[PDB]
Ligand SMILES: O=P(O)(O)O[C@H]1[C@H](OP(=O)(O)O)[C@@H](OP(=O)(O)O)[C@H](OP(=O)(O)O)[C@@H](OP(=O)(O)O)[C@H]1OP(=O)(O)O
């Protein structure tokens with residue numbers, strides 16, 4: 001009956017839908033995530049179509065969301081919090097990696113504040129499952145840079161504070177397919193400027209990934 005979905009991070013009840021390609025995410029504290037999906041739909045629908053998993057509907061307090069891992073034989077997933085945290089400053093200055101597929105193998109700890117060097121090392125660890133075909137893992141990095149670039153650009157013209165939103169990086173083991181999308185709108189707020197904190201997180205990730213795509217080992 002109820003099949004639990006293998007979350008990489010967060011603390012929310014998320015199960016597979018009774019149907020292919022869907023996950024059900026419980027809104028625990030309020031329905032603010034629903035309000036914010038709806039708001040983004042009416043005000044920035046281009047942003048919603050390019051960067052956010054499809055919201056198919058609502059069932060009581062469950063959101064029926066597109067499963068970002070569905071079209072993948074062997075998905076590797078990384079959750080990076082790019083929005084402001086509630087209290088804590090970010091474990092990597094401008095963002096916090098919250099988890100990744102096989103993070104336990106590398107003694108990853110989401111409470112550990114990291115140097116630039118540890119941060120880069122953890123992202124390399126997340127890429128390890130993509131294997132030795134060096135000039136093909138960098139195709140994955142470059143496609144991520146392509147979308148993160150457009151996202152950082154588009155974020156300048158969006159009057160929301162993306163408190164607590166994450167980037168979900170995905171690539172298949174065979175490196176044939178990858179994507180990144182914005183998730184978790186539960187704490188997103190209206191404002192009358194753009195979100196320089198969140199933009200700074202994206203540009204910083206664009207910087208790290210660019211260094212990875214370019215270094216010659
Ligand atoms: O589960 P995450 O995505 O890492 O985010 C959590 C989550 O925030 P929300 O649930 O409001 O999004 C926690 O709430 P719980 O799941 O623990 O109920 C909260 O813990 P507190 O409510 O006790 O503040 C914690 O915040 P923090 O660790 O800053 O106190 C915060 O983590 P972030 O710091 O990454 O926002």
Ligand SMILES: Nc1ncnc2c1ncn2[C@@H]1O[C@H](COP(=O)(O)OP(=O)(O)O)[C@@H](O)[C@H]1O
Nearest residue numbers: 007008009010011012053066067068069079184
């Ligand atoms: N649309 C999605 N498709 C696939 N996995 C998802 C999707 N949304 C969330 N996840 C997974 O769930 C985890 C937590 O989701 P998130 O929306 O951030 O919930 P929370 O509010 O509990 O932090 C992510 O780390 C990711 O692994």
Ligand SMILES: [Mg+2]
Nearest residue numbers: 010164166184
């Ligand atoms: Mg989250």
